[PDB]
Every structure is written in C-alpha cells, then in structure tokens.
Coordinates of C-alpha atoms and ligand atoms in Angstrom, one line a residue:
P6 CA -49.1 189.7 362.0
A7 CA -49.3 190.8 365.6
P8 CA -51.2 194.0 366.6
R9 CA -49.5 197.1 368.0
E10 CA -50.0 197.9 371.7
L11 CA -50.4 201.7 371.8
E12 CA -50.6 204.1 374.8
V13 CA -53.2 206.7 375.5
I14 CA -51.4 210.0 375.7
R15 CA -54.2 212.5 375.9
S16 CA -58.0 212.7 375.8
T17 CA -59.6 215.8 374.5
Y18 CA -63.2 217.0 373.8
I19 CA -63.5 218.6 370.4
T20 CA -67.2 219.1 370.7
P21 CA -69.8 217.6 373.0
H22 CA -70.2 214.4 370.9
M23 CA -66.7 214.2 369.5
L24 CA -63.8 213.0 371.7
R25 CA -60.2 213.0 370.4
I26 CA -57.9 210.3 371.9
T27 CA -54.2 210.6 371.2
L28 CA -52.3 207.3 370.9
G29 CA -48.5 206.8 371.1
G30 CA -45.7 204.9 372.7
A31 CA -43.0 202.5 371.6
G32 CA -45.7 200.4 369.9
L33 CA -46.0 202.9 367.0
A34 CA -42.4 202.4 365.8
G35 CA -42.3 201.6 362.1
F36 CA -45.9 202.6 361.7
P37 CA -46.0 204.0 358.2
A38 CA -45.9 207.7 357.4
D39 CA -48.6 209.8 355.6
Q40 CA -51.6 207.8 356.9
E41 CA -54.1 210.6 357.6
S42 CA -57.6 209.5 356.6
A43 CA -56.5 205.8 356.7
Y44 CA -58.4 203.6 359.0
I45 CA -57.3 201.3 361.8
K46 CA -59.0 198.5 363.7
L47 CA -59.3 198.9 367.5
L48 CA -59.2 195.4 369.3
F49 CA -61.3 194.8 372.3
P50 CA -61.3 191.9 374.8
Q51 CA -63.7 189.1 374.7
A52 CA -63.5 186.5 377.4
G53 CA -62.8 183.0 376.0
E54 CA -63.3 184.4 372.4
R55 CA -61.9 186.3 369.4
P56 CA -61.4 190.0 370.0
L57 CA -64.0 192.4 368.7
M58 CA -62.7 194.9 366.1
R59 CA -63.9 198.4 365.6
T60 CA -63.0 200.7 362.7
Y61 CA -61.7 204.2 363.2
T62 CA -60.0 206.9 361.2
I63 CA -56.6 208.3 361.7
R64 CA -57.6 212.0 362.1
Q65 CA -54.1 213.3 362.6
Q66 CA -50.6 211.8 362.4
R67 CA -47.4 213.2 363.9
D68 CA -44.1 211.3 363.9
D69 CA -44.6 210.1 367.5
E70 CA -48.4 209.8 367.8
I71 CA -51.8 209.6 366.0
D72 CA -55.2 211.1 366.8
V73 CA -58.5 209.2 366.6
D74 CA -61.8 211.1 367.0
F75 CA -64.6 209.1 368.5
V76 CA -68.3 210.0 368.0
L77 CA -70.0 209.7 371.4
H78 CA -73.1 208.0 369.8
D79 CA -76.1 206.7 371.6
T80 CA -76.1 203.0 372.5
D81 CA -72.5 202.5 373.6
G82 CA -70.4 199.9 372.0
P83 CA -67.1 198.6 373.1
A84 CA -65.3 201.4 371.3
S85 CA -67.3 204.6 372.2
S86 CA -67.5 203.2 375.8
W87 CA -63.8 202.6 375.9
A88 CA -63.1 206.2 374.6
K89 CA -65.2 207.8 377.3
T90 CA -63.4 205.8 380.1
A91 CA -59.9 205.9 378.6
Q92 CA -57.2 207.0 381.0
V93 CA -53.8 208.3 380.2
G94 CA -51.3 205.5 380.2
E95 CA -53.9 202.9 379.3
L96 CA -53.1 200.5 376.5
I97 CA -54.9 199.3 373.4
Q98 CA -54.0 197.0 370.6
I99 CA -54.7 198.0 367.0
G100 CA -54.4 196.6 363.5
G101 CA -53.8 198.8 360.5
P102 CA -53.4 201.1 358.9
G103 CA -55.7 200.1 356.1
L104 CA -55.5 202.1 352.9
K105 CA -57.0 205.5 352.8
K106 CA -59.5 206.6 350.1
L107 CA -59.2 210.3 349.2
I108 CA -61.7 212.1 346.9
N109 CA -60.6 212.1 343.2
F110 CA -58.6 215.3 342.9
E111 CA -59.0 215.2 339.1
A112 CA -62.3 217.0 338.7
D113 CA -63.8 220.4 338.1
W114 CA -65.6 220.6 341.4
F115 CA -66.1 218.6 344.5
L116 CA -68.8 217.2 346.8
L117 CA -68.0 215.6 350.1
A118 CA -70.8 214.4 352.3
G119 CA -71.2 212.3 355.4
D120 CA -72.2 212.2 359.0
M121 CA -70.0 212.5 362.1
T122 CA -68.3 209.1 361.6
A123 CA -67.0 210.5 358.3
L124 CA -66.1 213.9 359.7
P125 CA -62.5 213.0 360.5
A126 CA -61.9 211.7 357.0
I127 CA -63.8 214.6 355.4
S128 CA -61.7 217.0 357.4
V129 CA -58.5 215.5 356.0
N130 CA -59.9 215.6 352.4
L131 CA -60.8 219.3 352.9
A132 CA -57.3 220.1 354.1
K133 CA -55.7 218.3 351.2
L134 CA -57.8 219.9 348.4
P135 CA -56.3 222.5 346.3
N136 CA -56.6 226.1 347.5
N137 CA -58.8 227.0 344.5
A138 CA -61.1 224.0 344.8
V139 CA -64.8 224.7 344.2
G140 CA -67.8 222.8 345.5
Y141 CA -69.6 221.6 348.7
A142 CA -69.1 219.7 351.9
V143 CA -72.3 218.6 353.6
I144 CA -72.0 217.2 357.0
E145 CA -74.7 215.8 359.4
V146 CA -74.0 216.4 363.1
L147 CA -76.0 215.8 366.3
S148 CA -76.2 219.4 367.5
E149 CA -75.1 223.0 366.7
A150 CA -72.4 222.5 369.3
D151 CA -71.0 219.7 367.2
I152 CA -70.3 221.9 364.3
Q153 CA -66.5 222.5 363.9
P154 CA -64.5 225.2 362.2
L155 CA -62.7 223.1 359.6
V156 CA -59.9 224.1 357.3
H157 CA -61.2 224.2 353.7
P158 CA -60.6 225.9 350.3
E159 CA -62.5 229.2 350.4
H160 CA -64.7 228.3 347.5
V161 CA -65.7 225.0 349.1
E162 CA -68.9 225.7 351.1
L163 CA -69.5 223.9 354.4
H164 CA -73.2 223.0 354.8
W165 CA -74.1 221.5 358.2
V166 CA -77.1 219.3 358.6
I167 CA -78.2 219.1 362.3
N168 CA -80.0 215.9 363.2
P169 CA -80.2 214.6 366.8
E170 CA -81.6 211.2 365.7
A171 CA -80.3 209.2 362.8
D172 CA -83.0 208.6 360.1
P173 CA -83.5 204.9 359.1
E174 CA -85.1 206.4 355.9
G175 CA -81.8 208.1 355.1
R176 CA -83.5 211.5 354.2
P177 CA -81.5 214.4 355.9
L178 CA -78.3 214.3 353.9
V179 CA -79.8 213.6 350.5
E180 CA -82.5 216.2 351.0
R181 CA -80.0 219.0 351.6
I182 CA -77.7 217.9 348.8
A183 CA -80.6 217.9 346.3
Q184 CA -81.1 221.6 347.1
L185 CA -77.5 222.5 346.1
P186 CA -76.9 223.8 342.6
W187 CA -75.2 221.5 340.2
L188 CA -72.1 223.3 338.9
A189 CA -70.4 223.3 335.5
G190 CA -68.1 220.5 334.7
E191 CA -67.6 217.0 336.1
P192 CA -67.6 216.6 339.9
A193 CA -65.9 214.1 342.2
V194 CA -68.1 212.8 344.9
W195 CA -67.0 211.3 348.2
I196 CA -69.7 210.0 350.6
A197 CA -69.5 208.1 353.8
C198 CA -72.2 207.7 356.4
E199 CA -75.0 205.5 357.9
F200 CA -76.0 202.7 355.5
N201 CA -79.5 204.0 354.7
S202 CA -78.3 207.6 354.1
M203 CA -75.6 206.4 351.8
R204 CA -78.1 204.2 349.8
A205 CA -80.5 207.2 349.5
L206 CA -77.6 209.4 348.2
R207 CA -76.4 206.7 345.9
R208 CA -79.9 206.2 344.5
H209 CA -80.4 209.9 344.1
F210 CA -77.2 210.2 342.0
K211 CA -78.1 207.1 339.9
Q212 CA -81.6 208.5 339.0
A213 CA -80.6 212.1 338.6
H214 CA -76.9 212.5 337.7
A215 CA -75.1 209.3 336.7
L216 CA -71.3 209.5 337.4
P217 CA -68.5 206.9 336.9
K218 CA -67.3 205.1 340.1
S219 CA -63.8 206.7 339.7
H220 CA -65.5 210.0 340.5
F221 CA -68.1 208.6 342.9
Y222 CA -67.1 207.0 346.1
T223 CA -69.7 205.7 348.5
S224 CA -69.2 203.9 351.8
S225 CA -71.4 202.7 354.7
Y226 CA -69.6 203.5 357.9
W227 CA -72.2 202.1 360.3
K228 CA -75.8 200.9 360.3
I229 CA -78.7 201.7 362.6
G230 CA -79.6 198.6 364.8
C231 CA -76.3 196.9 363.9
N232 CA -73.0 196.6 365.8
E233 CA -69.9 196.6 363.6
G234 CA -70.0 192.8 363.1
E235 CA -73.6 192.9 361.9
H236 CA -72.9 196.0 359.8
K237 CA -70.1 194.2 358.0
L238 CA -72.4 191.5 356.7
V239 CA -74.9 194.0 355.4
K240 CA -72.1 196.1 353.9
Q241 CA -70.6 193.1 352.1
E242 CA -74.0 192.0 350.8
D243 CA -74.8 195.5 349.5
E244 CA -71.3 195.8 347.8
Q245 CA -71.9 192.4 346.2
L246 CA -75.4 193.3 344.9
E247 CA -74.1 196.7 343.7
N248 CA -70.9 195.5 342.0
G249 CA -72.5 192.5 340.1
Ligands
FAD1 C1 -63.6 203.2 357.3 C2 -64.3 203.5 358.6 C3 -63.8 204.6 359.4 C4 -64.5 205.0 360.5 N1 -64.0 206.1 361.2 C5 -64.7 206.5 362.4 C6 -64.2 207.5 363.2 O1 -63.0 208.0 363.0 N2 -64.9 207.9 364.3 C7 -66.1 207.3 364.6 O2 -66.7 207.7 365.5 N3 -66.6 206.3 363.8 C8 -65.9 205.9 362.7 N4 -66.4 204.9 362.0 C9 -67.7 204.2 362.4 C10 -67.4 203.2 363.5 O3 -66.7 202.2 363.0 C11 -68.8 202.8 364.0 O4 -69.5 203.9 364.5 C12 -68.8 201.7 365.1 O5 -70.0 201.0 365.1 C13 -68.5 202.2 366.5 O6 -68.2 201.1 367.3 P1 -68.9 200.9 368.8 O7 -68.1 199.9 369.5 O8 -68.9 202.2 369.6 O9 -70.4 200.5 368.5 P2 -71.0 199.1 368.0 O10 -70.7 198.0 369.0 O11 -70.5 198.7 366.6 O12 -72.6 199.4 367.9 C14 -73.3 199.7 369.1 C15 -74.6 200.4 368.7 O13 -74.3 201.7 368.4 C16 -74.8 202.0 367.1 N5 -73.8 202.9 366.5 C17 -72.5 202.7 366.1 N6 -72.0 203.8 365.6 C18 -72.9 204.8 365.7 C19 -72.9 206.2 365.4 N7 -71.8 206.8 365.1 N8 -74.1 206.9 365.7 C20 -75.2 206.3 366.2 N9 -75.2 205.0 366.5 C21 -74.1 204.3 366.3 C22 -74.9 200.7 366.4 O14 -75.9 200.7 365.4 C23 -75.3 199.8 367.5 O15 -76.7 199.8 367.8 C24 -65.7 204.4 360.8 C25 -66.2 203.4 360.1 C26 -65.5 202.9 358.9 C27 -66.1 201.7 358.2
CA2 CA1 -69.6 227.2 345.6
CA3 CA1 -79.1 215.9 342.1
CL4 CL1 -79.0 202.2 344.8

C-alpha cells in the first residue's frame, strides 16, 4: 500500500506550543470518513534509508482536509521541526488512518487525562461525550498560555496541570488526579501521555482503585530521552510485560 501525498493548506498557531497544520489536496481522495481522534503516520526522508515515521492525531476532519496539531516540544525531531518550517503548498506523505480509541461511553462518570500530545484526542473525546456526562479531564500543558478553551459537557471539569519540564518520575498528572474526589458508580478512564507519567497513573489505579481494561485505557505517546523509534521498543516491551 502506497502513502498519500498531501498538501499543506494552512499553518495556524493555536497556542504558543501548539501549531495546527491543515492538510489537503487530491491525495486525500477516498480517505475514510469519521476519523477524528484516529492517528496517522507522517513519513520523513532519510537519505539512502527507510523513511522515518512519526505518529499524529487527526484533530479535525472536513470532507476536503484534515487538521493535525503539533506540540512544539523541546529537542526538535523530524516532525516538530517540519511543522515549524512547513510552507503552504508543501507536500508530505502519510500512512493511516489507524483506528481511533475513544473513551468507553458506557459508564457513570469519566476521567480523561494526558499531556499536550494527547490534547487533540482528548479534545475529540470531550466533544463527543454526552451533554450530561460527569467527571474530570486533567491535562498537562507547558504554560498558562497553552491552556485552551475546549468544548466539553458542563459537568465535566477541566483541570490543567502546568508543567514546563516533563518529569521523568511521572508525578505531576497522577498527583493532581489523586486529589480529585472519586464519584459514585463505575468510571471509564482514558489516559495518554509520556511513558513514565502513564506508568505512574497506571500504578496508582492498580494499587488504589482496580478497574477492568474495557473501562481503563492507557497509552504511552512518547518517552523522555527517546525518539519515536526508541519509544516504540519500550512501548512494546511494556505492553508485553503488562499483558502477560
Ligand atoms: C497515537 C499517538 C498519537 C499522537 N498524536 C500526537 C499529536 O497529535 N500531536 C503531537 O504533538 N504528538 C502526538 N503524538 C506524540 C508524537 O508521536 C511524539 O511527540 C513524537 O516523538 C514527535 O516526533 P518528533 O519527530 O518531533 O520527535 P522525535 O524524533 O520522536 O524525538 C525527538 C526528541 O523529542 C522528544 N519528544 C518527542 N515528543 C515530545 C513531546 N511532545 N514533549 C517533549 N519532548 C518530546 C523525544 O524524547 C526526543 O528526545 C502522538 C503519539 C501517539 C503514539
Ligand atoms: Ca464533577
Ligand atoms: Ca485514586
Ligand atoms: Cl504498573
């Protein structure tokens, strides 16, 4: 299967550390509908070698284009660097879409949590939740300026954790979450963030409040000190340890 060549239509700052690139062009023909929160693979040139791949979320989808929001993280990679320099009319090949994972809607209350890499996906889950949904969304951003006014059910509270430097100990997100009252009934939990933060969260829930995996999604989206290729190995190893 060959990749799609897509065209950069627009580049837009959402917040100082979040840049939205809009992709379109003839290359999107037959791309499937209803893919918001699904992920794609951006393909990047290597001289004399296989292309690098970087994973991103479809933040928004219209019938003629899709939006991808790039966190402008420290220590540029091929992807964040590409986003910052991307001109209108420039081309990029992608693979995808890969299947989306939404939070389990079949629950009494909800908890979504993650860092900026998960913010696009969390924003789609919040917009899709029922109007009367109850619970919490806890999101780690780099500054106050990177807080966004998201659409959400009025009884889902948005808690922002502001942290300029990612914590290899994984403390910020779990420490805020453990201060949030546990509500009545069974929750569904959706968590995606930096590996160590997700493991801290996962460990918290195992020790304190054990939940079935159907109602408890965890995912490492990146890892400190690793590029995506290195992260993938650690992710796979962790998945294998955890699921057997
Ligand atoms: C399912 C899925 C969906 C994702 N969706 C998005 C999305 O929509 N938007 C988005 O921005 N990211 C998203 N990510 C995370 C993204 O794939 C990684 O951030 C990726 O490493 C960025 O690629 P890069 O080329 O810029 O950096 P890389 O070449 O992979 O790494 C370069 C350096 O930057 C560090 N690094 C990578 N990401 C971050 C970060 N965000 N903060 C601080 N340091 C970082 C690495 O540890 C490494 O040291 C998603 C990840 C997954 C698995
Ligand atoms: Ca509440
Ligand atoms: Ca708890
Ligand atoms: Cl664990």
